[PDB]
């Protein structure tokens, strides 16, 4: 009577250990270097649901967030929004 499904705890990302049990926007805020509106815009460009926890967001969406946030000019983020 088995069943299979598609969770991660405290987890590492860009050498920052953020939890999977909070909201994803503020998880990217506690990633050091970027803040509230930057994390919000990064989630909006990564095209994820902003209400999921970080225990959700499978690794392909995760690396999408990584590549977008580490290639920020290459994803239409303006310079005045850049640091």
């Amino acid at each position: 009577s088995l069943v299979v499904q598609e969770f991660q705890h405290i987890l590492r990302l860009l050498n920052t250990n953020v939890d999977g049990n909070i909201k994803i926007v503020y998880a990217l805020t506690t990633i050091k270097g970027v803040g509230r509106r930057y994390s919000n815009l990064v989630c909006k460009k990564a095209d994820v649901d902003l209400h999921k926890r970080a225990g959700e967001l499978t690794q392909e969406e995760l690396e999408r967030i990584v590549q977008i946030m580490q290639n920020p000019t290459h994803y239409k983020i303006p310079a005045w929004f850049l640091n």
Binding site: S1, L2, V3, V4, Q5, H9
Partner: protein
């Protein structure tokens, strides 16, 4: 020698007649190869190689150049005679002649290109020759591999792994040649030849990469991927119905699990083959290990399409054995075991049965298998901490701050204790493994190796985390441990 003289004569050159004479010489080179079967010109065949290069250059010149009925017939017949000489040289080469083999294959390839740009029949004759070829070190390599040939394995690794159009016409002509009743039996004899021809992971239905094109004009080899998979499935069903052995059986099961299923169309016939392969249980100590990759195929099929296997975890209880520890597929079988036991409907009886079986296994199991089995036990107790009572009962531990009545009761309880676990009971729900503790894990604490002992101390210390990286602590071996300990 005479071959080089004829070469120079044909190169300098009634030019058609001279070329015909040279072709007659290159066709008598088949008789020369027959003599070479006894001795390849004192075991060298350099003259044969020179004559082959000559015949290749002559065929090139003939294709570039050539009563038009008679002339064209003579030209085509000379080209076909050279090709037939090359094919017969590749076919009757029971003698392991690398240079002559390479020459025959290269001449065949060049003539095939010339025919595709000038003249499928040549291809099927080529495959008939390559499959009528046979060698002693080629037939049924039993230690590993499928067929340690020369000519078909080199033909595969520098001719078949390059051209998707040849791959399509390859499988379609194999369908035709299996409907051919005698060459069907030729394939049934050379079952391993296709196996060593197919394990190279770079076929047409693998869209991960692209293959180059041999002929300057492909005759619609991109017509249908499902047609390609139909050729695949027909060839594979015929070969799995015909003339199977044990090593070839394990090889086709490996290629079935990893490489075949992107190229396939009929997983129900695969399910029937796979359930026969998984229910294959005999007194053969070499054939009793097939259910590992058989269950691998069965479970990935069950994931792709909702099929069943009754008394599944009962069969897993039956299949967990020390022979799994002794065979070298326990890494992927433990990947399979993890995705089996990651279900959220299993119970305390099931996890207790499996953990006690693995506890007797780590009592008697080699240290590479020990470092495989520690992470699974750790993550299993972590996923179901409903069985921490077997790691420590709360009733059997003592404390000074309790009455002598309960002291004496604890003493009499420890006297009337009996270990109630049953090994021979095959029902994992019925094995009373909840009361049996792990003295075998206490022995794993009293192991001999330092790293294994420290993993046992990780068992003894309280479970603080849950991410143990089974894949990182999954593949280890004696030689790998030697390298790590030296480093």
């Amino acid at each position: 020698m005479v071959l080089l003289i004829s070469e120079i004569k044909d190169i300098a050159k009634k030019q058609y007649n001279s070329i015909i004479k040279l072709i007659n010489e290159l066709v008598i080179p088949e008789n020369v190869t027959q003599l070479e079967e006894d001795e390849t010109e004192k075991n060298l065949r350099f003259l044969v190689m020179s004559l082959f290069q000559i015949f290749r250059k002559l065929f090139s010149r003939g294709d570039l150049t050539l009563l038009e009925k008679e002339q064209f017939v003579n030209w085509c017949r000379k080209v076909y005679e050279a090709f037939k000489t090359k094919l017969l040289a590749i076919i009757s080469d029971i003698p392991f002649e690398t240079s002559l083999g390479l020459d025959s294959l290269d001449v065949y390839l060049q003539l095939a290109e010339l025919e595709s740009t000038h003249f499928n029949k040549t291809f099927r004759k080529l495959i008939i020759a390559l499959w009528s070829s046979n060698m002693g070190e080629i037939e049924d390599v039993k230690s590993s591999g499928a067929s340690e040939n020369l000519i078909i394995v080199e033909f595969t690794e520098k001719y078949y792994t390059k051209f998707a159009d040849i791959q399509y016409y390859f499988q379609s002509e194999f369908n035709q040649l299996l409907e051919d009743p005698a060459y069907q039996d030729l394939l049934l004899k050379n079952v391993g030849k296709w196996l060593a021809l197919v394990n190279h992971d770079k076929h047409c239905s693998s869209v991960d990469a692209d293959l180059e094109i041999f002929v300057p004009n492909p005759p619609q080899a991109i017509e249908n991927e499902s047609k390609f998979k139909s050729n695949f499935e027909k060839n594979w069903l015929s070969l799995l119905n015909g003339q199977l052995s044990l090593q070839q059986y394990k090889s086709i099961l490996l290629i079935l699990h990893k490489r075949i299923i992107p190229h396939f169309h009929t997983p129900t016939k695969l399910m029937d083959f796979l359930t026969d392969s998984y229910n294959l249980q005999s007194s053969n100590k070499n054939a009793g290990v097939v259910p590992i990759l058989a269950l691998n195929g069965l479970f990935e099929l069950m994931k792709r399409f909702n099929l069943e296997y009754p008394n599944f975890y009962m069969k897993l209880y039956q299949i967990i054995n020390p022979d799994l520890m002794h065979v070298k597929y326990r890494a992927r079988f433990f990947r399979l075991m993890d995705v089996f036991l990651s279900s959220t409907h299993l119970s305390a009886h099931l996890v207790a049965s499996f953990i006690k079986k693995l506890a007797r296994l780590t009592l008697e199991s080699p240290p590479s298998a020990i470092v495989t089995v520690i992470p699974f036990i750790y993550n299993l107790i972590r996923k179901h901490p409903n069985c921490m009572i077997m790691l420590h009962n709360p009733a059997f531990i003592s404390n000074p701050f309790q009455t002598p009545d309960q002291v004496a009761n604890l003493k009499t309880l420890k006297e009337n204790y009996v270990d109630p676990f049953d090994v021979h009971e095959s029902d994992p729900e019925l094995t009373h493994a909840l009361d049996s503790s792990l003295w075998e894990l206490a022995s794993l604490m009293e192991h001999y190796h330092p790293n294994v002992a420290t993993l046992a101390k990780i068992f003894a210390q309280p479970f603080k985390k849950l991410s143990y990286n089974m894949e990182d602590f999954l593949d280890w071996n004696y030689d790998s441990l030697l390298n790590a300990e030296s480093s």
